[PDB]
């Protein structure tokens, strides 16, 4: 492939460099339309800018935490982090979010990796070996209420059991209701005067629930869960302007008030170098 062809002096009536940008086109002008060039080859394919590659590496999408401790006398397991959940979503942590929102609709399979590490902040004789049980709780399935409810039987709901310190990995097909996920939605769930605005009402997909299977030892053990997400088989439509201001909320486009100028001011003139 040639990156530049050889081109010499020109004295024409045919001027490729004068255009009318009002038309909305970006005319494909090249170095050889306005200087004299020599042949050179590309030596490159643009492999690593493919959208599959761009969205295809694992990104941290969520960090939560649960603890193993005596539940005796706990009136609210959920509240003691005897187990916790995550009303699943991808726009919670921003590095990956800015990347996805370069597109309007996106379609992909997900590969999740879940790393779990334990901490024992206060005096323990040892490090126990805990098994985590992360379970998928889709919309309509009975959320669990205690850390050892009938729910955890999970007879119809996919669940994975792995050890703290290890990693669990599994992949979920594209579960969207439509043909693509929108990264974005200028609508409501119905014509209500006070209903919420945005994708929050679309991007409804359940929540994932974690717990330790082990009963309690004499000390307490903090287990912190990190969920990583990798898109595989990516398809993206309609590019948009990149995010400039900071994010404030999952699912709304809102930016913070009295934010700071995002364009760097010159130290000098327009004329400055």
């Amino acid at each position: 492939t040639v990156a530049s062809i050889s081109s010499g002096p020109k004295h024409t009536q045919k001027v490729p460099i004068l255009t009318a940008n009002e038309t909305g086109a970006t005319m494909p002008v090249l170095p050889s339309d306005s200087i004299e060039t020599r042949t050179t080859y590309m030596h490159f394919n643009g492999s690593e800018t493919d959208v599959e590659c761009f969205l295809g590496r694992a990104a941290c999408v969520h960090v939560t935490e649960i603890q193993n401790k005596d539940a005796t006398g706990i009136d609210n397991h959920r509240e003691a982090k005897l187990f916790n959940d995550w009303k699943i979503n991808l726009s919670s942590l921003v590095q990956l979010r800015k990347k996805l929102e370069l597109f309007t609709y996106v379609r992909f399979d997900s590969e999740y990796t879940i790393l779990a590490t334990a901490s024992q902040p206060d005096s323990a004789n040892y490090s126990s070996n805990l098994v985590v049980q992360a379970m998928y709780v889709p919309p309509g399935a009975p959320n669990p209420k205690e850390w050892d409810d009938y729910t955890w039987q999970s007879a119809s709901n996919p669940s994975v059991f792995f050890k703290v310190g290890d990693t669990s990995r599994f992949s979920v097909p594209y579960v969207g209701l439509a043909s693509a996920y929108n990264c974005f939605y200028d609508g409501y769930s119905h014509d209500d005067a006070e209903t919420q605005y945005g994708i929050t009402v679309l991007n409804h997909m359940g929540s994932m629930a974690f717990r330790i299977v082990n009963e309690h030892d004499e000390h307490k053990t903090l287990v912190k869960i990190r969920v990583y997400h990798r898109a595989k088989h990516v398809e993206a439509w309609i590019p948009r302007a990149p995010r400039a201001l900071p994010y404030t909320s999952i699912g709304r486009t809102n930016y913070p008030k009295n934010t700071e100028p995002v364009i760097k001011k010159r130290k000098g003139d327009i004329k400055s170098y």
Partner: protein, 40 residues
């Protein structure tokens, strides 16, 4: 070799090697030729 039955479980896809910027760079209704005048 796929070891698994479902398609979601296969590895990453392989390069589009599609590439056609004209839907974005030249969505004009009447075709513009480089070198010919923009507005006639």
């Amino acid at each position: 070799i796929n070891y698994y039955k479902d398609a979601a479980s296969t590895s990453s896809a392989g390069q589009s090697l599609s590439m056609d910027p004209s839907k974005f760079t030249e969505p004009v209704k009447d075709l513009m030729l480089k070198g010919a005048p923009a507005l006639n």
